[PDB]
Amino acid sequence: DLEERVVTINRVAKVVKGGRRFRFTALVVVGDKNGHVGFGTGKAQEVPDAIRKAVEDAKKNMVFVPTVDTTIPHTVVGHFGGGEILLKPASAGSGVTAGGPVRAVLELAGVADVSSKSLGSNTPINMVRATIDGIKQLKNAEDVAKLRGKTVEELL
RNA sequence: AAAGAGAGUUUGAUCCUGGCUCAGGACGAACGCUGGCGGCGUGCCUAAUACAUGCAAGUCGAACGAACGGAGG
Numbered sequence A: 001d002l003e004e005r006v007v008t009i010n011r012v013a014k015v016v017k018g019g020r021r022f023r024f025t026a027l028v029v030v031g032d033k034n035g036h037v038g039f040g041t042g043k044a045q046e047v048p049d050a051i052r053k054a055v056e057d058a059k060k061n062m063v064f065v066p067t068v069d070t071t072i073p074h075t076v077v078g079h080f081g082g083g084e085i086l087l088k089p090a091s092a093g094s095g096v097t098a099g100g101p102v103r104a105v106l107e108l109a110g111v112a113d114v115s116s117k118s119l120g121s122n123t124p125i126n127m128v129r130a131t132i133d134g135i136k137q138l139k140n141a142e143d144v145a146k147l148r149g150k151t152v153e154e155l156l
Numbered sequence B: 001a002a003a004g005a006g007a008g009u010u011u012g013a014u015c016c017u018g019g020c021u022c023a024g025g026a027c028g029a030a031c032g033c034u035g036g037c038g039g040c041g042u043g044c045c046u047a048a049u050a051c052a053u054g055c056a057a058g059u060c061g062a063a064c065g066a067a068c069g070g071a072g073g
């Protein structure tokens, strides 16, 4: 299946000679606890329509998270735009410590032991983009062992 | 083995930079409302300002000076 959570909704405007027109832009993070997660944005005159459009957008750009032993294999840093998110492994039973959007994306991804810090701006969309970007350069022991032509025991 | 949570605020709406404020912990603490008990601790942070009253450094007859029972008269 696919579970979704709403992050934020913002009312944006645009000026015309007859006044102004407003509409809502909604950010939605979808994912399942198997290790798949994604984010999306929607825009509509009504909030539920924006949520539905954001969900449909998020369903099209899913990614995967390596979650060996329910923990990030190694620390990484995202760098998208003006946001910075640092993710590092945590011990078993430590829970998840993160900011709002980062907590949402990590919880929907499926990880249970990870600690993160925000080192940049606090704009939610840039925070989510930075978190996903940091998730990009994750690694698995088997994959790097195959890349370097050796076994896991030799590498670890 | 250890390993870090953010929020509000400049705009008609944005994205950055930047300051201000708040969410936590600790006192030899003080003030306000209130107040049942037990154990263990702490109590002039200011005037090293001025001091009633009492006690805190004396002891050795094995180196040289006591009343009584009591020799004797």
Ligand SMILES: [Mg+2]
Residues within 6 Å of the ligand: none
């Ligand atoms: Mg797009």
Ligand SMILES: [Mg+2]
Residues within 6 Å of the ligand: B008, B021, B022
């Ligand atoms: Mg505040």
Ligand SMILES: [Mg+2]
Residues within 6 Å of the ligand: none
């Ligand atoms: Mg009191």
Ligand SMILES: [Mg+2]
Residues within 6 Å of the ligand: B034
């Ligand atoms: Mg009282």
Ligand SMILES: [Mg+2]
Residues within 6 Å of the ligand: B038
């Ligand atoms: Mg008591």
Ligand SMILES: [Mg+2]
Residues within 6 Å of the ligand: none
């Ligand atoms: Mg003193």
